[PDB]
Write a structure and sequence with these properties.
part of a larger assembly; 7 chains; A alpha+beta (about 290); B mainly alpha (about 280); C mainly beta (about 130); D alpha+beta (about 170); E mainly alpha (about 150); F alpha+beta (about 110); G alpha/beta (about 150); E: about 150 residues; mainly alpha; 50s Ribosomal Protein L17, Chain: A; 3-stranded antiparallel beta sheet; extended; F: about 110 residues; alpha+beta; two-stranded antiparallel ribbon; two-stranded parallel ribbon; binds magnesium ion; binds zinc ion; RNA-binding; Large ribosomal subunit protein mL45 (chain C)
Chain lengths: ~290, ~280, ~130, ~170, ~150, ~110, ~150
RNA sequence: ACUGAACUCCUCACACCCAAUUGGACCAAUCUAUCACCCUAUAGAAGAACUAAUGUUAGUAUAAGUAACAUGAAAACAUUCU
């Protein structure tokens, strides 16, 4: 049953969490220096593999915590809730930086993942849904996409406007829940064990483990929903303010199975768009 | 400064009273407070209850195993009440079953068992013991005496009464101090049930009667936010019980509850218990 | 137990502020367990004030809490081995041998890590200054 | 006079058991004898009640009232001592649990009126008190909905008894 | 009722208002950047623009010279007006001044403004900058722009 | 006219704790992305403005030293140059105000 | 006054009369002074009446301290845990006797306003009145002006 | 017909609803004798009891954060200007 699948996947997720936490016991003070333009030269002594860029922001001030979406720990984008590993330089990236491209990509991935959760828990039980992948599309594309294979019983069914609005309502319920984005650097073995059923996710995990030198893969969970991340994600789901599942386009070349691309669009609280601009963005997010 | 001492002392007394009210001292078992003689207290316990306990049995009934363990641990730096409590619990359950089965011959064994469990449960027996001063005479390792220990001691006292004066006197004691705890209580306030309609259907099957027909006898304010629905259950066009409610479902459920009470003979206007 | 009356006689006045200042408004559950090697004297020197250096390699337990009773340093159960070079001073007519100062060598191992994280501000910048 | 607020920082609670929720830190601070009306100070105190430390500082930095600067200094001192002496891990993880103004010891001066008559001026002084509690500010009390409010009404209806009878 | 009244009531009357604005304008011409209560800066901004226009009219223009003589209480600034400021703005047609709000005056909490003549040698004011075009919203709008350009 | 009765603390509280009298929470406060300082949306950052005012004061002191007397306003443009800077081609024919510090990052 | 005072409902301790009557007073403690005119009456009570009272009330444990604090007193402790302390200062033997007998006959429940002079757990035998008692029913349960 | 009092009856208890005035039974606190030696007793005393004198002194309210009061401008704080 899908509920049992989610339960066992969550159990494996927590098992791996505890395993890594035990692997990193006690407290090793790592020095992380704020290399950001503001408040330069500050140093945080932090608990190895326990503290997070969020904890560093908490030390800095509440404005940093609320405005900071990603961290460039040693020039690499780290999730705000991803435990720090070694002494490093840290700089916090917001939505309004001069070049926020990394933050935009992270927001885009997180919105896609939220869409994936909504899709998987939307349809009636009898129908089976397979979350194939979240294609990495530029923000200029105007809509974040999530690819899903629906059942043959539904390959002839296209969502109605009311169905799409129900998807948006579920997404907003998730936003209201405001669930943190939990991360795990998990070896391909445990990742495959978690996603054994989903063939698509299995092969995606294999691809990622091939691309990276080792077999380390990025697993992300909002709540009860675990997915492979193409990269770092947003800290929490409350960052999204405006969110809309706009359309579902059936990819033209579908001989084996019919891949439906759920397209949607979102804007965070920091970058709220007026009603009319939002309507135009919605219109353009249906292509 | 005004000369005098009495006003100052009165103010000190008032301050002390207020201090005790604001930060009352942690509770202390009555034994540790002044004016305590265990032998006199236990004899008074017996005389209060109007029963000729044997002092040795009652003393043994008031001592718990945990108290013995704590006393031995302290002595490092006695017969418990276990057997008496077991005897008392067994006899009390059996004799309460006798009382209840005599009073309500129609009550099903499940109902009788639930009533006995209610009457001998931690809450009821704890209340009875507390207001009978069992707690004061109880020798336990922690204070206030936990309800489980208090129940154990109360049933040990019942066992001591049994060994001292006999089944008849012990039955009178149970009647007076546990059977009274169901006065004013409602059948399903004591015996928690689910799906009373289903339970009534089961009972009517046992009696070889068809499933009752739920039917709306009286109604008021149907479309408002405070409706009144009277739902009656009919057995062959004959009303067996009707009940009120806010929604039709609630009224039907409670009519089933009324029907169960009537079938089991545990109605509100039933013959009172005889003492 | 913050027995300052006895601590005054037990330690020198030069040591008492160190003993009792930073520990104010926080409970410590320091305890002792059997030593590892016998204590022996190291050296002694000398209006006239006595001075004895004693080397100890004992085993101890620490648990320092907050005003609010939440642990902030050291497990209370797991003991640690302590190497100390304690220097006693005595008054020379009615004074006794009291802890004067503990010599920490530079090669001593780092102390226990602290549970909580800490931020260390960089150099504050004036309006006319720039970070370099 | 009373100086209980200062003493409130010196109460040491017993060490907590491991299976016990972490007690939030509490920092009491005060400034006494501020040359300012307690009635005027009360508005600033009320303004910042229940807000995070950073939010309170932001609000006070852009307030024109004289008392805002004094309250900001008191809050900054409270934050500093919370970090240094009350084992508060994060500076910003503090919210104003209590903030009130109290009457200070005042001085009486004469105001000369027009016909050889006079009034008694009071050179008013005020105290300012804050308690800072560690943790996020407690959420504002949600406005009660029609559903809950009708639930309360129906509970009141059900509570009715037949009064003055058997 | 003050429907359509465009001039604030400042100082001790009309003449005093003119003199106050004149002193502010002389300070502005001398220093190229002046802090003053917001309302007074707002009232004087129009006069500053008009002086730049009169300086553009030319040194030899008698009316412009008389206007400058009245409006610049320090007469060393009249050559400055006719030979530095006016040539500086010869290309522009307007908007010679930049006025920004400044934190309230500490003394009396007055609403304060800084008014400068654009192009001065002084360090630039911390001007407000719009959000970067690379932000999420701006990139989505750029996508709209490109799609509209292509489609239509 | 004189009050006919003392106003009770209850009435006084109802009056002086009215929302109309309470201080309103400001919602236009934010953080200056340049220096991270707090500022109001429509107002200049206080810290940045203080920087600029101090630098302007220093430059003006240099200007005053150069002019040497009242009523000596130059009829030519002005250019501020810091240590290690040379007048450019367009800086020709403009009075040079020399500053002993290095060029501020925000000064261009 | 009633509005300025707590109130309760008439009640017993453990249904004190149903099966058997149990005297709720369980302990009396007389703190009496050897010397002092305040406790002269208490001394006479201890000499002449306390023994007879004790043998009349075998369920009440009576302690006599002969060493009071701030006044001679009698502290009555009841089974329900209530403790009523009464000064016997400057009271005669008969006054103390009546006071002690009152404590003996009284229950531990608070002496406050009792809302009702009666207490039934089963106020109704024929069924509590509701608007539909005495209201006739109609054929097919048709409400007034109902078409069918 | 019913309703209808503090009238009357009923269960229990009773000295327990006038101004001025008058008779009487008690009594807070204080001091003294002698006790008690715990916070009281018997007596002897007396600056012996305050919801009220536009009472006296002190405190703090209300009116009220009200009436009212105050700093010419810019600036390099040298200075200049009105
Ligand atoms: Mg005069
Ligand atoms: Mg004016
Ligand atoms: Mg009548
Ligand atoms: Mg009469
Ligand atoms: Mg007098
Ligand atoms: Mg008085
Ligand atoms: Mg008076
Ligand atoms: Mg006032
Ligand atoms: Mg008024
Ligand atoms: Mg006025
Ligand atoms: Zn800034």
């Amino acid at each position: 049953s899908p509920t049992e699948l989610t339960e066992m996947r969550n159990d494996l997720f927590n098992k791996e969490k505890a395993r890594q936490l035990s692997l990193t016991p006690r407290t090793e003070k790592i020095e992380v220096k704020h290399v950001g333009k503001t408040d330069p030269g500050t140093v945080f002594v932090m608990n190895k593999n326990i503290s997070t860029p969020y904890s560093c922001a908490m030390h800095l001030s509440e404005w940093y915590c609320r405005k900071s979406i990603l961290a460039l720990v040693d020039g690499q984008p780290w999730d705000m809730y991803k435990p720090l590993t070694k002494s490093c330089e840290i700089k916090f990236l917001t939505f309004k930086d001069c070049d926020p491209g990394e933050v935009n990509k992270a927001y885009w991935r997180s919105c896609a993942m939220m869409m994936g959760c909504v899709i998987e828990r939307a349809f009636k039980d009898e129908y089976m849904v397979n979350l194939v992948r979240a294609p990495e599309v530029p923000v200029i594309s105007g809509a974040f996409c999530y690819d899903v294979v629906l059942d043959s019983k539904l390959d002839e069914w296209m969502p109605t406007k009311e169905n799409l609005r129900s998807f948006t309502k579920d997404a907003h319920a998730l936003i209201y829940k405001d669930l943190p984005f939990e991360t795990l650097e998990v070896e391909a073995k445990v990742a495959l064990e978690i996603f054994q059923h989903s063939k698509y996710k299995v092969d995606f995990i294999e691809e990622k483990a091939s691309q990276n030198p080792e077999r380390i893969v990025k697993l992300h969970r909002i709540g009860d929903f675990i997915d492979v991340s193409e990269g770092p994600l947003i800290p929490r789901t409350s960052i999204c303010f405006q969110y809309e599942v706009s359309a579902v386009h059936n990819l033209q070349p579908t001989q084996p199975s019919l891949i439906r691309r759920f397209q949607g669009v979102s804007l965070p609280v920091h970058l709220r768009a007026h009603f009319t601009i939002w309507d135009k963005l919605l219109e353009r997010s249906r292509k | 400064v005004k000369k005098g001492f009495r006003a100052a002392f009165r103010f000190q007394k008032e301050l002390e009273r207020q201090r005790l009210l604001r930060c009352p001292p942690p509770p202390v078992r009555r034994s540790e407070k002044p004016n305590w003689d265990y032998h006199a207290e236990i004899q008074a316990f017996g005389h209060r209850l109007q029963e000729n306990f044997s002092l040795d049995l009652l003393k043994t009934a008031f001592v718990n195993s945990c108290y013995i363990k704590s006393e031995e641990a302290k002595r490092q730096q006695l017969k418990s009440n276990q057997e008496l409590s077991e005897q008392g619990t067994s006899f009390s359950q059996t004799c309460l079953t006798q009382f209840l089965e005599d009073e309500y011959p129609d009550m099903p064994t499940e109902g009788i068992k639930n009533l006995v469990d209610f009457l001998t449960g931690e809450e009821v027996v704890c209340h009875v013991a507390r207001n009978l001063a069992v707690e004061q005479l109880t020798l336990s390792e922690e204070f206030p005496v936990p309800p489980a220990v208090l129940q154990q001691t109360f049933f040990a006292v019942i066992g001591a009464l049994l060994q001292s004066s006999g089944p008849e006197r012990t039955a009178l004691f149970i009647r007076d101090f546990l059977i009274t705890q169901m006065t004013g209580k409602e059948l399903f306030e004591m015996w928690k049930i689910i799906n009373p309609m289903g339970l009534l259907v089961e009972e009517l099957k046992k009696r070889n009667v068809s499933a009752p027909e739920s039917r709306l006898t009286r109604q008021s304010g149907g479309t408002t936010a405070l409706p009144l629905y009277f739902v009656g259950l009919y057995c062959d066009k004959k009303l067996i019980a009707e009940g009120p409610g806010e929604t039709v479902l609630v009224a039907e459920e409670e009519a089933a509850r009324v029907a169960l009470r009537k079938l089991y003979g545990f109605t509100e206007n039933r013959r009172p218990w005889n003492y | 137990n913050s027995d300052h009356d006895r601590l005054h006689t037990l330690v020198t006045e030069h040591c008492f502020p160190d003993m009792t200042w930073d520990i104010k408004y926080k409970t410590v559950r320091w305890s002792f367990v059997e030593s590892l090697e016998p204590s022996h004297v190291v050296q002694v020197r000398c209006n006239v004030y006595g001075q004895i250096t004693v080397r100890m390699h004992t085993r101890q337990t620490l648990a320092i809490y907050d005003r609010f009773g939440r642990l902030m340093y050291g497990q209370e159960d797991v003991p640690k081995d302590v190497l100390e070079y304690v220097v006693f001073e005595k008054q020379l007519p009615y004074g006794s041998w009291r802890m004067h100062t503990k010599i920490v060598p530079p090669w001593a191992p780092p102390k226990q890590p602290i549970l909580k994280t800490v931020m260390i501000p960089g150099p504050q910048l004036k309006p006319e200054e720039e970070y370099e | 006079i009373s100086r209980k607020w200062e003493k409130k920082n010196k109460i040491v609670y017993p060490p907590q058991l491991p299976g016990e929720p972490r007690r939030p830190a509490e920092i009491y601070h005060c400034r006494r004898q501020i040359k300012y009306s307690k009635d005027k100070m009360w508005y600033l105190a009320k303004l910042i009640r229940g807000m995070s430390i950073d939010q309170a500082l932001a609000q006070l930095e852009f307030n024109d009232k004289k008392g805002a600067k004094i309250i900001k200094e008191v809050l900054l001192e409270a934050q500093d001592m919370a970090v240094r002496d009350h084992n508060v891990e994060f500076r910003s993880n503090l919210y104003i649990a209590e903030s009130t103004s109290g009457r200070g010891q005042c001085l009486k001066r004469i105001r000369y009126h027009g016909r050889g008559r006079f009034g008694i001026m009071e050179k008013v002084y005020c105290h300012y008190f804050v308690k800072l509690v560690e943790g996020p500010p407690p959420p504002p009390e949600p406005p009660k909905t029609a559903v809950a409010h009708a639930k309360e009404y129906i509970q009141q209806l059900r509570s009715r008894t037949i009064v003055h009878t058997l | 009722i003050s429907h359509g009244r465009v001039f604030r009531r400042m100082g001790l009357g009309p003449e005093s208002r003119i003199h106050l604005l004149r002193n502010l304008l002389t300070g502005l011409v001398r220093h190229e950047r002046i802090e003053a209560p917001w309302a007074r800066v707002d009232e004087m901004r129009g006069y500053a623009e008009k002086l730049i226009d009169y300086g553009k009219l030319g040194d030899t223009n008698e009316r412009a010279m008389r206007m400058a003589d009245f409006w610049l209480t320090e007469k060393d600034l009249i050559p400055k007006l006719f030979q530095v400021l006016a040539p500086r703005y010869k290309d522009q047609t307007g908007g010679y001044t930049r006025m920004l709000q400044i934190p309230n005056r500490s003394l009396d909490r007055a609403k304060m403004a800084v008014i400068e003549y654009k192009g001065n040698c002084l360090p630039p004011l911390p001007l407000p900058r719009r959000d970067s075009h690379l932000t999420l919203l701006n990139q989505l709008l750029q996508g709209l722009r490109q799609d509209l350009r292509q489609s239509q | 006219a004189a009050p006919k009765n003392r106003r009770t603390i209850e009435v006084n509280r109802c009056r002086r704790r009215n929302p109309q009298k309470l201080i309103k929470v400001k919602n236009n406060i934010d953080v200056c992305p340049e220096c991270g300082h707090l500022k109001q949306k429509h107002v200049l950052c206080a810290y940045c403005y203080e920087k600029v005012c101090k630098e302007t004061a220093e430059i003006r002191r240099q200007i005053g030293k150069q002019e040497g007397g009242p009523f000596k306003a130059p009829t030519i443009e002005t250019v501020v140059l810091y240590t290690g800077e040379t007048p450019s081609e367009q800086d020709q024919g403009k009075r040079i105000i020399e500053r002993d510090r290095k060029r501020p990052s925000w000064f261009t | 006054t009633a509005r300025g005072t707590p109130s309760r409902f008439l009640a017993s301790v453990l249904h004190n009369g149903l099966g058997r009557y149990v005297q709720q007073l369980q302990r009396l403690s007389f703190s009496v002074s050897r010397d002092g005119a305040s406790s002269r009456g208490a001394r006479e009570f201890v000499e002449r009446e306390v023994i007879d009272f004790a043998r009349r009330n075998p369920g009440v444990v009576i302690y006599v301290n002969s060493r009071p604090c701030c006044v001679p007193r009698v502290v009555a402790e009841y089974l329900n845990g209530a403790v009523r302390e009464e000064s016997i200062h400057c009271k005669s033997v008969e006054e103390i006797s009546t006071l002690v007998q009152k404590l003996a006959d009284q229950s531990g429940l608070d002496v406050i306003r009792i809302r009702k002079p009666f207490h039934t757990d089963n106020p109704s035998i024929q069924g509590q009145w509701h608007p539909f008692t005495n209201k006739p029913t109609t054929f097919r349960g048709l409400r007034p002006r109902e078409v069918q």
